[PDB]
Amino acid sequence: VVIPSPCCMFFVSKRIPENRVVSYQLSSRSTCLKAGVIFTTKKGQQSCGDPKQEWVQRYMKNLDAKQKKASPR
Numbered sequence: 001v002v003i004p005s006p007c008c009m010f011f012v013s014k015r016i017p018e019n020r021v022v023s024y025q026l027s028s029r030s031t032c033l034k035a036g037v038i039f040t041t042k043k044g045q046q047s048c049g050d051p052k053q054e055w056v057q058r059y060m061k062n063l064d065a066k067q068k069k070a071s072p073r
Contacts, residue, residue: 022042036049
């Protein structure tokens with residue numbers, strides 16, 4: 001899937017447990033006041049994650065090898 005360019009209202013109080021998160025949704029827009037990523041839990045939740053944190057980049061790092069099916073090589 002691919003998120004369009006939505007936004008958020010607040011930043012997660014902290015990171016998330018990889019055992020609960022499933023995938024994020026980057027939302028870089030100018031009409032908004034700030035820019036961050038949106039993560040979601042496997043239970044059906046959705047929290048906005050900040051890129052300044054390493055759990056967004058970390059998840060986003062492993063998520064890139066899954067979603068973006070580059071190649072088997």
